[PDB]
Design an enzyme around this catalytic site. Structure first.
Site, mmCIF file in Angstrom:
data_model
loop_
_atom_site.group_PDB
_atom_site.id
_atom_site.type_symbol
_atom_site.label_atom_id
_atom_site.label_comp_id
_atom_site.label_asym_id
_atom_site.label_seq_id
_atom_site.Cartn_x
_atom_site.Cartn_y
_atom_site.Cartn_z
ATOM 1 N N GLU A 109 1.092 -1.405 -0.291
ATOM 2 C CA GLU A 109 -0.078 0.035 0.020
ATOM 3 C C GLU A 109 0.746 1.023 0.220
ATOM 4 O OE1 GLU A 109 -2.544 1.779 -1.120
ATOM 5 O OE2 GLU A 109 -3.781 2.453 0.987
ATOM 6 N N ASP A 126 -8.050 9.958 -0.693
ATOM 7 C CA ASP A 126 -7.993 8.335 -1.356
ATOM 8 C C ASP A 126 -8.311 9.216 -2.452
ATOM 9 O OD1 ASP A 126 -8.741 6.206 -1.158
ATOM 10 O OD2 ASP A 126 -10.358 6.171 -0.249
ATOM 11 N N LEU A 138 -8.520 5.468 7.081
ATOM 12 C CA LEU A 138 -9.452 6.764 6.896
ATOM 13 C C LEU A 138 -9.591 7.047 7.806
ATOM 14 C CD1 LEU A 138 -11.940 6.381 4.673
ATOM 15 C CD2 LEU A 138 -13.473 7.220 6.887
ATOM 16 N N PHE A 173 -7.492 -5.491 3.540
ATOM 17 C CA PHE A 173 -6.537 -4.070 3.703
ATOM 18 C C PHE A 173 -7.495 -3.654 2.180
ATOM 19 C CE2 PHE A 173 -5.154 -1.396 6.976
ATOM 20 C CZ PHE A 173 -5.222 -2.623 8.328
ATOM 21 N N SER A 204 -12.366 -19.997 -4.134
ATOM 22 C CA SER A 204 -10.655 -20.799 -3.718
ATOM 23 C C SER A 204 -10.157 -20.732 -1.747
ATOM 24 C CB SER A 204 -9.967 -18.692 -4.204
ATOM 25 O OG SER A 204 -10.199 -19.036 -5.259
ATOM 26 N N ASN A 246 -5.160 -21.870 -9.622
ATOM 27 C CA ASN A 246 -6.516 -21.799 -9.707
ATOM 28 C C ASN A 246 -7.199 -19.981 -9.155
#
Lengths: 438, 70
Positions: free
Chosen positions: A212, A221, A233, A305, A318, A333
């Site tokens: 990030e 943002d 935030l 996140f 998954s 996959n």
């Protein structure tokens, strides 16, 4: 209208019914269980070495249990030699087991916090320092069991106890047991756990610092909201001062939009707690989270996140293979997903982390450095779980002797009945080690 | 061992205020050194046992008149 003495006969019939069954189960489970461990371990892993030291220390006390069963219900017949012999083995087992768990805590600290090059300190500790730091002081604390432990006649029957010349000796060994066998090992285990989770939470911070990105200033943002640190935030509000005040409240310090790397990590840890608490509440994310390791959880938190709780929940296909432990079949996959082609550099680092189970997908160091924490944290908590109802009994009984709680004969015998049965059940920590294999 | 060593003998938590008649009492024996309060336990002919303070004048007289329990 006559004054009567405090009869202890109501405690005698209590032991004669409940304790013969408890001492029989713990004896059979502790001799068949620990008996197999020594034959499989010693003859024909790193933590397994400490479990060999533990399974031999408790076994020595299992063959001591038939004497404990007879003394609690009938009388002491065995003599003055066996009286010292049982008292010495009891002292050894009390301090050896609690310090083996302390050394297990130290082993996990070196394997997780200083994993870079810890093969030497971890070996030295388990091969040499374990004898000097656990067995030498434990055998040095059996000296009073050779001096004061001896058989004595008391009213109705004979009792095998430690008899001191005066009350000053009684209260110094009373306070010595609390330090060496409860407080001091408790500090070692607590201080290890508190710096292992501190490292584990920091590793996620440096992981998302790479993905990030860290920002020590209030920034806008992609959606236009005021954010700071690693995607923390502040408010949905269009006001800068509203978010600036929200930051000052969360930190405590009056900041002008500027924060430190440490302050950014404190806010980050708060966001991880919120993400974890929400994941274990989701019916499709909770049965997966417990199945994962410590690094595989960090990779799942990274996805939360990046996409969100609702977003990660959409990987139902998954997440099913992720529990079945088919890490090579799930990654191929999951590589075909639209998420991988949305962001390719961040996704490849997270998917290879789920595939291998290594934090080295981000770190430029070694390879395949995986360590278990789940069997350890269970064994230590389950150990104090056996002793917790027994140490409650002593605490209440102490106030009766310290003249703070002054009640009748019934209350005086109630705390005894509690101590007498919780002592017998506290010896289940012997059976705790081989049962942990199930 | 441990629990059996804690409270294995009868103790006096209080003493008999009114003096007892010698005709109803059979024997006497003192409390264990393990007990917090010292005293004697008077065994009556009835079978029941009664606590008493050794410092009391009427108790010291009864110990002289009565034998120690077998």
């Amino acid at each position: 209208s006559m004054k009567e003495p405090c009869f202890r006969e109501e405690n005698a019939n209590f032991n004669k019914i409940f304790l013969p069954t408890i001492y029989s189960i713990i004896f059979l489970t502790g001799i068949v269980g620990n008996g197999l461990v020594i034959l499989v371990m010693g003859y024909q892993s790193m933590t397994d070495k400490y479990r060999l030291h533990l399974s031999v220390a408790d076994l020595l006390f299992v063959i001591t249990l038939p004497f404990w069963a007879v003394d609690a219900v009938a009388n002491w017949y065995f003599g003055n030699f066996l009286c010292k012999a049982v008292h010495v083995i009891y002292t050894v087992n009390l301090y050896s087991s609690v310090w083996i768990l302390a050394f297990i805590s130290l082993d996990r600290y070196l394997a997780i916090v200083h994993a870079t090059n810890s093969q030497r300190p971890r070996k030295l500790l388990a091969e040499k320092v374990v004898y000097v730091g656990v067995w030498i002081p434990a055998l040095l604390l059996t000296i009073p069991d050779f001096i004061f432990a001896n058989v004595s006649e008391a009213d109705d029957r004979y009792i095998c106890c430690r008899f001191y010349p005066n009350d000053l000796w009684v209260v110094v060994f009373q306070f010595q047991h609390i330090m060496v066998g409860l407080i001091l090992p408790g500090i070692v285990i607590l201080s290890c756990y508190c710096i292992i989770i501190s490292k584990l939470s920091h590793n996620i911070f440096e992981m998302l610092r790479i993905d990030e990105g860290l920002r020590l200033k209030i920034y806008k943002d992609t959606e236009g909201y005021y954010t700071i640190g690693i995607g923390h935030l502040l408010t949905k509000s269009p006001s800068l001062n509203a978010a600036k005040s929200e930051l000052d409240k969360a930190i405590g310090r009056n900041t002008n939009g500027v924060i430190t790397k440490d302050e950014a990590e404190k806010l980050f840890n708060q966001d991880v707690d919120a993400a974890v608490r929400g994941i274990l509440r989701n019916a499709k994310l909770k049965p997966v989270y417990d199945s994962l390791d410590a690094v595989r959880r960090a990779a799942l938190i990274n996805m939360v996140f990046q996409m969100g709780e609702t977003g990660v929940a959409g990987f139902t296909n998954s997440l099913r293979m992720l529990q079945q432990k088919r890490w090579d079949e799930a990654a191929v996959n999951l590589a075909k997903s639209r998420w991988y082609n949305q962001t390719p550099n961040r996704a490849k680092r997270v998917i290879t982390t789920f595939r291998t189970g290594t934090w080295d997908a981000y770190s430029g160091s070694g390879h395949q450095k995986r360590k278990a924490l789940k069997p350890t944290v269970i064994l230590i908590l389950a150990f104090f779980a056996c002793w917790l109802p027994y140490y409650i009994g002593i605490s209440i009984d102490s106030f009766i002797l310290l003249e703070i709680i002054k009640q009748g004969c019934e209350f005086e015998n109630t705390v005894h009945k509690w101590i007498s049965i919780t002592e017998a059940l506290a010896f289940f920590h012997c059976c705790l080690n081989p049962i942990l294999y199930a | 061992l441990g629990a059996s060593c804690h409270r294995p003998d009868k103790c006096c938590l209080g003493y008999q205020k009114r003096p007892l008649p010698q005709v109803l009492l059979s024997s006497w024996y003192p409390t264990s050194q393990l007990c917090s309060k010292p005293g004697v336990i008077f065994l009556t002919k009835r079978g029941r046992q009664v606590c008493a303070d050794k410092s009391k004048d009427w108790v010291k007289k009864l110990m002289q008149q009565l034998p120690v329990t077998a």
